[PDB]
């Protein structure tokens, strides 16, 4: 209701901020291409500007990463999926950090270097959600965490139901549908605002999602090349494994050597920019875009890449098409230019996400999948150059569907989900090839499930955050008798002023275990420290007893122990026998155990 | 993996059965229209056949409802959502019943009378799921229930993600995403099989969902009639309330009078058919389709209803269009013919679902919403007959989007969900007007949430099944001390043969509470009866002790009590103090309490 109005103000602010970032991004970027062209074409000096623009943007981004952000380097979703798995970091929910990240993401988004977008944007959206939740509704915790994740991604791209499905469908175990309904309303009106502000101010036409891909939708598929999609299962799954292996091969390479650590404490800013420099050394278009078309910044790159005609036959014409004119070298076959383009993007994208940046994990993967798709579509167009006939309708084949299905497939492979296909077609604007793209997506997903772990789980693995569960453990003999902590704090009401002051001076935690007597040992409840503080001071100048909801039977199986703490989403365990409290089991202590 | 292969065999069988039912349905239906036409047009005798065909189909359906089905009358989803809420009915999971329902549903689907499809089909799909789960995987319970619901609806219409979202998003509280992944793979390959079998055998073209609705997708909306959608919020919500009130007005009318009860035991078959007769008395086309076009069986009715041109201007032509030629009376304005058509469908649809039939709750609602949509689209076309201009593109307006958004809206209003819009556009084949249809859907959903309860919740309310929870109860003083049952069964190991035989002869339940001694009263575990039976007989001719997972603190708040039994999905409670077992709280006993 009016918590929906709370949420709609949230989406209103985020859409104003997104309009700001891509507005200034597009203006700066076209100003780059504008001044770059319009000074003069001299191959030493255009080389000079071709070096000096990415490095100055990376200097702004890396300075803002270093100096202003004390902890927000390498930000994204896996820390907050660790937060909803339990590890709360309220200091990492600092208001000062939000503005400290986002414009650097603008530097990342306004850059022609491949960055992600969504991940840390989801993170700061949930940050802003939590802070305005502190500010509004005075003007339930992991509920707010989960809804913040949902509102963040569905409010990112105006794609509501893929946002909320991507928030729930992996980054949880169970989920309450009330919050589904709430955050879905938030995501839908937030989706609404993103396009209409583009119409009240400076205009897109009416209602593209972003990418109207005008296909014929008349005899679309057909049913003869579908087993070729089987290849786009298996091969894609093949390549999918390679990223995680090499990501591990670089994350260890992040932290293997003491030399660069010493030099990082000595001088941190130099290393990213220079290797930015050297990948810029492979980007200059009359230098190297003669064979790759590297002067394709990714948004218009994928828009020209979803061109619904065969480029081998349009290699037959010198026609000024749209931006796809960049896809012609006059001597080299374009399968080769796509081949080298993708492989250089392969080793460029991992180094791009390597350096210390808040990185979303989706768009360069989308470009790479779409690249592989139009690759195989153009070569199957080469394999059957004819295409087909039918009854007063000559229908020859077309490669655009291959591009959009691969751009679904590979990010499904990275992300271990199904929501990539929904956001894929929800941004595509047509949903023709939906069942073949879903089958190939699930083929690659189960190959990935077979071979390699998740992206973000490997990320928190290298960052070493303790899982936060672990499941499917059939122990021979494992019992929590060697495990429980026998440290118990205790307060009595018949303790008077001095005893209760001593208990204040000995204890630190927010709420406290109550038993009757330490000899009886039986757990009774939990009490706030500060209420006792209140009673002492404001009597010197209403005794309510709340109940303990849980108890650990001391031979609980490790499957069910994991399951109980998972589905409660709770921290601690008071372990009794016969009611008499015997031990304390902590969440992190269970993780340190269940490491094996 | 291979449980996916288990599931893919499930979807394979269901798609063969669906092809069978709509194949024979379409052949019988066109054979009806064929012989009906081709005998002769004499207005007494075509009246004779116009009576005698629906009544003979209803005789087959009602005889199969009465004689063969002992319990499957009035079947659907709310009994199985009551099952996953707890009320297990294994006898209602009888194999003999599955074939006992489905062909009658064929009689329902092959009928020109409005029936639903999905509900009891989901029910029998989960029936077949459970029985083959008994048969396969020798060749975890509510997991199988939930996945059976998901596989059933996503395997119904080839619309996987709307199926699994409609299975989870209301008909649960929490849900495990592993089963999401499993059933989603099942639903997607099941979706795949439904269309390709139509291509290996007798053909649709390639890959319609069902309904390719060829819109221009070029300046689609625009942004001027969108506040008219506000009306399609509020008015739709208005009408939404009316169904539940009148549904209650007829379900009480189902069971208010002893006269028809006596006559039902006397002779049950006569009543439905005759009122079928009298609604047939309003259907005969040169009788009454002169003003309504009642000779529109619903599938082709909605296909002709999504015609992308203005029928008021095409009231200007005598053109042989497609089936929309039926939309012309030569003297009466077509807004009037749509007006009377809808209102007669209003009082026809409730009587259609009234009589004792396994009824899905979606398609006649879809027709009615689509009717109201093309109504308001044609009258706004009448309000602005001009439509608009733009830069070398004359774009006049079109009513088809209004039809598809209302066919989303009203079934969202009935079903209290958001999944109606996904299955709406997933069968529509284009997703142009997606954000306006989602906003209007959520507008009507919150109006419905404000005013009237759910459909199926009102259904089980009238059928009086005990909820199975109830939430948001802030008690003054309610405590389970007046509540717990002090009947305890007990077995000891040091009981020998005669004592354990007496315990067999006194007890009946599947597993049993173990304490140490009845004087100690402390609950220890639970033991199978039959294992004791085994020990007695196969020693006459390995003692393992399993643990009790739960204990009820005797002052537990009613919110949290409801919450604990809800999220466990479990039946009983052993209520102890100091470990010593004191009482037993049952699920149905809690429901009998929480009635207030």
* CB of A404 closer than 8 Å to CB of A364: no
Among residues 425-454 of chain A, which lie with CB inside 8 Å of chain B?
Answer: 425-426, 429-435, 438-439, 442, 446
Spatial distance between the Cα atoms of A324 and A316, rounded to a whole number of angstroms: 13
User: What tokens does B42 get?
Assistant: 């004499």
For residue B388, the cross-strand partners are B395
**DSSP designation for B293:** -
- The interaxial angle of helices A3-39 and A118-135, nearest 10 deg, is 140
The approach used to solve this structure was: cryo-EM
Spatial distance between the Cα atoms of A108 and A57, rounded to a whole number of angstroms: 8
The DSSP line for A174-242 is ---HHHHHHHHHHHHHHHHHHHHHHHHSS---S---S-------SS-S-SSSHHHHHHHHHHHHHHHHH
Other beta carbons within 10 angstroms of residue A200's beta carbon come to 8
Q: What chain A residue is nearest to B192 in terms of C-alpha separation?
A: A435
Spatial distance between the Cα atoms of A57 and A50, rounded to a whole number of angstroms: 12
**Contact residues on chain B for A308, CB-CB shorter than 8 A:** none
Other beta carbons within 10 angstroms of residue B401's beta carbon come to 25
Spatial distance between the Cα atoms of B521 and B410, rounded to a whole number of angstroms: 57
B366 a known binding residue? no
**DSSP designation for A5:** H
Q: Do A214 and B217 touch (CB under 8 A)?
A: yes
Nearest to B579 among A169, A195, A578 (CB): A578
A142 touches chain B (CB under 8 A): no
User: What tokens does A556 get?
Assistant: 């609980």
B35 a known binding residue? no
Helix (H) or strand (E) holding A582: strand A580-585
Spell out a b/e string for B231-244, using b for 16 or more CB atoms within 10 Å of the CB, else e: ebbebbbebbeebb
Place of tokens 């077609």: A425
Spatial distance between the Cα atoms of B468 and B458, rounded to a whole number of angstroms: 13
CA B550 vs CA A84, A462, B56, B208: distances in Å: 26, 37, 57, 53
**Sign of the C-alpha dihedral computed for residues A70, A71, A77 and A82 taken in this order:** negative
Other beta carbons within 10 angstroms of residue A411's beta carbon come to 27
Place of tokens 């065969």: A310
CA-based end-to-end distance of chain A: 47
Spatial distance between the Cα atoms of B518 and B295, rounded to a whole number of angstroms: 74
Spatial distance between the Cα atoms of B236 and B369, rounded to a whole number of angstroms: 9
The alpha-carbon gap from B502 to the nearest alpha carbon of chain A, in Å, equals: 30
Please tell me whether residue A102 adopts helix, strand or coil conformation: helix
* CB of B136 closer than 8 Å to CB of B171: no
Helix (H) or strand (E) holding B348: helix B334-354
Nearest to B223 among A206, A422, A430 (CB): A206
CA A230 vs CA A149, A406, A435, B190, B222: distances in Å: 34, 12, 13, 17, 41
Place of tokens 């989803």: B77
Spatial distance between the Cα atoms of B134 and B130, rounded to a whole number of angstroms: 6
Alpha helices in B40-94 (DSSP H): 45-63, 77-84
* Distance, C-alpha A425 to centroid of its chain: 19
For residue A109, which of A22, A36, A30 has the smallest C-alpha distance?
A22
Among residues 549-568 of chain B, which lie with CB inside 8 Å of chain A?
Answer: 549, 551, 553, 555-556, 560, 567
Q: What is the resolution of this structure in A?
A: 4.3
For residue B106, which of B78, B141, B65 has the smallest C-alpha distance?
B65
Name every residue whose Cβ is closer than 8 Å to that of residue B586 and which is 6 or more positions away in sequence.
B485, B571, B572, B573
Other beta carbons within 10 angstroms of residue A96's beta carbon come to 10
CA B69 vs CA A419, A501, B66, B94, B120: distances in Å: 42, 74, 6, 11, 13
**Contact residues on chain A for B446, CB-CB shorter than 8 A:** 1, 185
Helix (H) or strand (E) holding A3: helix A3-39
* CB of A104 closer than 8 Å to CB of A121: no
Give which of A553, A570, A582 to mutate to test B binding, by max B Cβ within 10 Å: A553
Spatial distance between the Cα atoms of B92 and B72, rounded to a whole number of angstroms: 8
CA B119 vs CA B92, B122, B358, B363: distances in Å: 15, 5, 8, 11
For residue B153, which of B195, B113, B192, B190 has the smallest C-alpha distance?
B190
Nearest to B442 among A188, A195, A548 (CB): A188
The alpha-carbon gap from A576 to the nearest alpha carbon of chain B, in Å, equals: 10
A180 a known binding residue? no
Q: What is the 3-state secondary structure (H, E, C) of A231-289?
A: HHHHHHHHHHHHHHHHHHHHHHHHCCCHHHHHHHHHCCCHHHHHHHHHHHCCCCHHHHH
């Amino acid at each position: 209701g009016e918590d929906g109005i709370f949420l709609v103000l949230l989406g209103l602010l985020m859409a104003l901020v997104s309009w700001s970032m891509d507005y200034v991004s597009a203006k700066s970027l076209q100003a780059y291409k504008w001044s770059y062209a319009q000074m003069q074409p001299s191959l030493p000096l255009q080389f000079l500007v071709w070096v000096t623009f990415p490095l100055v943007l990376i200097l702004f981004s890396a300075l803002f990463c270093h100096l202003i952000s004390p902890q927000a380097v390498g930000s994204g979703i896996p820390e907050m999926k660790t937060i909803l798995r339990g590890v709360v970091l309220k200091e990492y929910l600092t208001m000062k950090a939000f503005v400290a990240k986002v414009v650097a993401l603008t530097a990342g988004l306004g850059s022609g270097i491949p960055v992600g977008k969504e991940g840390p944007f989801v993170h700061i959206a949930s940050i802003c959600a939590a802070v305005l939740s502190k500010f509004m509704s005075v003007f339930y915790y992991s509920d707010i965490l989960t809804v913040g994740c949902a509102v963040g991604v569905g409010c990112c791209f105006g794609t509501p139901l893929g946002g909320v499905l991507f928030s729930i469908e992996v980054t949880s175990t169970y989920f309450a549908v009330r919050n589904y309904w709430r955050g879905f309303f938030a995501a839908t009106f937030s989706a609404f605002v993103f396009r209409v502000l583009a119409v009240w101010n400076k205009d897109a036409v009416t209602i593209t999602a972003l990418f109207r891909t005008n296909f014929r939708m008349d005899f679309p598929f057909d049913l003869k090349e579908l087993p070729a999609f089987a290849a786009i299962g298996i091969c894609c799954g093949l390549l999918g494994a390679v990223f995680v292996y090499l990501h591990r091969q670089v994350m260890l390479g992040v932290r293997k050597h003491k030399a660069l650590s010493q030099f990082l404490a000595k001088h941190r800013l130099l290393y990213p920019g220079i290797v930015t420099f050297v990948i810029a050394s492979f980007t200059f278009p009359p230098g190297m875009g003669q064979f790759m078309a590297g002067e394709l910044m990714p948004r218009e790159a994928i828009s020209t890449l979803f061109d619904n005609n065969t480029w081998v036959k349009h290699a037959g014409d010198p026609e000024s098409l749209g931006q796809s004119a960049v896809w012609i070298h006059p001597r080299v076959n374009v399968v080769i230019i796509i081949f080298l383009f993708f492989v250089m993007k392969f080793w460029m994208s991992i180094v791009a996400t390597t350096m210390p940046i808040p990185c979303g994990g989706f768009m360069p993967v989308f470009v790479l999948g779409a690249a592989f798709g139009r690759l195989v579509g153009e070569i199957m167009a080469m394999l059957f150059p004819d295409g087909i006939l039918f009854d007063d309708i000559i229908y020859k084949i077309l490669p655009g569907g291959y591009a959009v299905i691969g751009a679904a497939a590979l990010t499904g492979a990275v992300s271990h989900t199904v929501s990539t296909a929904v956001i894929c077609f929800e941004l595509t604007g047509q949903i023709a090839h939906i069942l073949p793209m879903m089958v190939a997506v699930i083929l690659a997903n189960m190959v990935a499930q077979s071979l390699q772990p998740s992206l973000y789980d490997s990320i928190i693995q290298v960052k070493k955050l303790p899982y936060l569960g672990w499941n499917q453990l059939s122990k021979y003999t494992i019992f929590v008798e060697d495990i429980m902590v026998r440290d118990v704090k205790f307060v009595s009401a018949s303790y008077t002023y001095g005893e209760l002051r001593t208990l204040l001076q000995t204890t630190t935690v927010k709420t406290l275990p109550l038993v009757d007597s330490k000899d009886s040992m039986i757990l009774l409840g939990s009490v706030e420290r500060s209420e006792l503080q209140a009673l002492l001071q404001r009597h010197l100048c209403s005794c309510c007893i709340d109940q303990s909801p849980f108890q650990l039977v001391e031979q609980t199986t490790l499957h069910k122990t994991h399951t109980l703490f998972s589905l409660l989403g709770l921290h601690l365990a008071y372990v009794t026998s016969m009611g008499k409290l015997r031990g304390v089991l902590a969440l992190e202590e269970l993780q340190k155990a269940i490491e094996g």
